[PDB]
């Protein structure tokens, strides 16, 4: 009820998808037919958000364009017989208002988020951040997360339990103490992509955050961490060490990391199987490919 603007950092290089991402933004990759950024925009609308501050890069024009009307394209589609599609290409743009925020160089997720400071209304008390390459299903974890912030103030992040092998890929929470609800916990530290030996838990940060504006000040104090980037994680950890309250909402359901082929492909399968048109066939197709590989393997 309080969130007006949601910050969607989409200015990365997407190295894990190269060469494809040389000119295609990972954020626009179709989960069946729909980009994760469009998925994120829809979730933000559901949250009541009225604007989307998209952090973008100079060589990623499509990100913002996806949310603008393309009369060239709509016209073409008219004279071809399909108004049905003109609607599909207007959905994102119509869902919410996209406000582009340029990030010249990909200095970090944290640095990206800091860029949106000037863009929020002075009247906004929280910074809602949604990573466009991360899906938390069913949608609504943000509604749960806001409830927790109302109750405890401070910042709140969404977490998922992860396998020992996936811990190095995420921001990992250091649990401080449990809470009235088993799915809400207070945290004592946050660490970005730790070696498996030095990971405080198996609780990993998904791309959902409801942060206290204090973050911006914490982001100006932080120095570069993992991979030489200015990490949102490190600023959250800063706030933690200062005494600011930071809780996690532990998500029980489906989570899809669209950020690399390993998570993206299964996401396409997942959504592909429930699709009214492709469902049946995909299943058959995939079962045969799985079998083909099993055979290959033994041989």
């Amino acid at each position: 009820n309080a969130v007006k603007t949601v910050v969607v950092p989409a200015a990365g290089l997407g190295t894990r998808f190269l060469p494809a991402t040389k000119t295609v933004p990972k954020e626009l990759l179709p989960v069946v037919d729909t980009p994760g950024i469009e998925l994120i925009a829809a979730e933000a609308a559901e949250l009541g958000a009225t604007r989307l501050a998209i952090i973008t890069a100079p060589n990623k024009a499509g990100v913002l364009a996806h949310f603008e009307r393309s009369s060239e394209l709509e016209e073409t589609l008219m004279e071809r017989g399909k108004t049905d599609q003109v609607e599909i290409i207007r959905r994102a743009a119509d869902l919410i208002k996209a406000v582009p925020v340029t990030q010249d160089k990909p200095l970090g997720l944290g640095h990206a988020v800091g860029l949106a400071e000037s863009v929020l209304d002075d009247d906004e008390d929280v910074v809602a951040v949604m990573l466009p390459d991360d899906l938390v299903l069913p949608t609504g974890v943000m509604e749960r997360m806001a409830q927790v912030r109302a109750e405890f103030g401070g910042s709140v992040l969404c977490a998922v339990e992860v396998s020992e092998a996936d811990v190095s890929k995420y921001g990992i929470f250091e649990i401080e103490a449990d809470t009235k609800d088993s799915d809400v916990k207070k945290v004592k530290g946050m660490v970005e992509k730790p070696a498996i030996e030095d990971a405080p838990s198996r609780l990993a940060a998904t791309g959902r955050y409801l942060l206290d504006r204090k973050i911006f000040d914490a982001l100006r104090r932080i120095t570069p961490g993992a991979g030489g980037e200015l990490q949102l994680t490190d600023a959250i950890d800063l706030l933690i060490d200062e005494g600011h309250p930071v809780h996690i909402v532990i998500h029980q359901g489906k989570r899809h990391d669209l950020g690399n082929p390993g998570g993206y492909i299964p996401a396409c399968v997942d959504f592909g199987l429930s699709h009214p048109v492709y469902g049946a066939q995909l299943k058959d197709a995939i079962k045969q490919i799985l079998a083909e590989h099993e055979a290959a393997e033994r041989i």
Copy 2:
């Protein structure tokens, strides 16, 4: 036999992937991490082609750019010393030289091929066409098609047997007779996307063509067909009727149609399972997803 130019029609709307394709060309979608265009480019270079005539559209600039140096991106990956990443994004340009050919409006695949006429060297004997959303594996069918052409002269296409389910999506051949070779059949007609009841065979046209320069002539005499588009198939069918010799090489191996989600997903799964980095985890993830779907469908 001496192919110099290979025509790669990459100017369509990609309706099947909308809304993602609003700004992203389907030809650039990652099969794991590599666009189908880059794979076709590799298949063309393998054939000994030296140049790629990419029919592109005004709104699809990424297609050409994928084949040209990306200064700022290499400079960004350099700072970080992502050396392997720099080579990755140079690969396409190193494979073959891309020549853009604009098709202002998606008048059909036939029309697109027709725009390549002027681009070819006058010394060029055939019109080699490789559709960028269709993988025929392993690469080499084009070499076999050239042998067939050297022998019977005339025009040659590549066919794969397809289920009734896939019939209406492809160009289907009308068989005349079995020839000298088991894999080669002489064709007496071609129909674009027939209904199942109308399909003269189960042999569908793969996007691989070695056409006699006479198609240009033929392409100017056809009228719109399926979709109100100017179909290449319709021109070939025209030549056949005017007694031009047309043969098909029937591909026995794997074939992936990347042109739509139904075929793109499984291609991704198929290449993904063979991937050194993603293989194992994909296998488990997809098994789990299949199993979750089973339970859901019961529950």
Copy 3:
């Protein structure tokens, strides 16, 4: 009559390099307004409802000028200029026709064939780097065509130093109307010696659809380019009637600095905001030059 007007704008603009490295010469301001926009209202004035703009892959700006600037519009109101920027797009419907390589004016014009409606019987071409003032020659030209049928071009007298920059006519017969002559020849950029006259073609043509067939019969000429002049000449050589309407009024070649600069001065002097100051500024700059030359 005219429904569509062909505006070739896919050239390289080498005379303005290095500026034209990214800027289309067709977009340079005549004070504040691009020549293409000036051609667009001349087109609209005539009746045309479509503008077939021949463009190049790297001149996205050309068409964009006739498209909406939502991004830019949202920035403007915030602080009477949004009026100004919506102008060109509201004057007429731009239809982009891509010409991948600049093979020639003649080649560029040929690309429009497939774009003109079937019921269309004239090929109206207006070069966007050439101003014929006041607007309306095309109304005149159209009259000459209603009478004589055939193809009509607009000319203006020019001088030896400036003869080699244009398409030059070979006069056949004077005529009734002092300003309408029949032509028996047309040569592109003839050396000073060769010019069959001093009557040069401006960028205004009303051509019979036959120009399309003629364009397929010619070979490269003057600059290794497929010259529209050459196809016109072929049509002449074969008995197709071709007449020129001679413009006695003002004309500006915005296609090169020597022509663009004076065009800016001309419109600038009549400017309600800038006129007075420009006048003073230029008069002093001239004076400084005069002095510099002697001194």
Copy 4:
């Protein structure tokens, strides 16, 4: 000087509708854009980088300083060897570094964006506005001398007519120096009404600023036109006792930011062109005469 900051992220409203897609900084002065003249000026002073403040809808600004593989090839085809070098000049002269200004919040704002782009080595913020020509080039060399001998901040002014005060930052003079061309300043006002102008000395777009403007730029409130004015920040620095001196340029100065200054600039350079010179003189004189008679 290592980095010259060049603010080119403006709307260029004065040249609309043309500037809808064309950056005003790219308009040819005959055939050379102001940004290229400014780049040549920066190079002459020894700068190796140009930090260009650019806007999302002005890609050409930066493209102008990059190699056009597609255009160079097309020109090689027609064998135009000179032209290739012509389109390479800018790019060869200096390294362009883009800095994006999403919205045109002001010249001061724009300048602020270049902070994190300067090296620590660098003691000064050299700013050259690409729509203003101070001729002949070299005023910055002079301004440097002045800074060396007074420390602090240095601007370049030109005497201007009453008619033109409102278009510029106008200085309030405080005192003279050993040199008649150098004055210490006591205030700066952006675009004052005629009655309100404290001098007839206008700021040209040349600055050698102490690194303290960054700090000041964060502090000033928007000023004239709703913008964060660089002038207001320089004034703030004045108001807190920081030393600011102006080199008064006695020579030629061409304001290319609006049609009134741009047209005359083109005439002036055109009259000197070995190719267009003579013909322009004649064409212009003739046009003036027609206007007379009209």
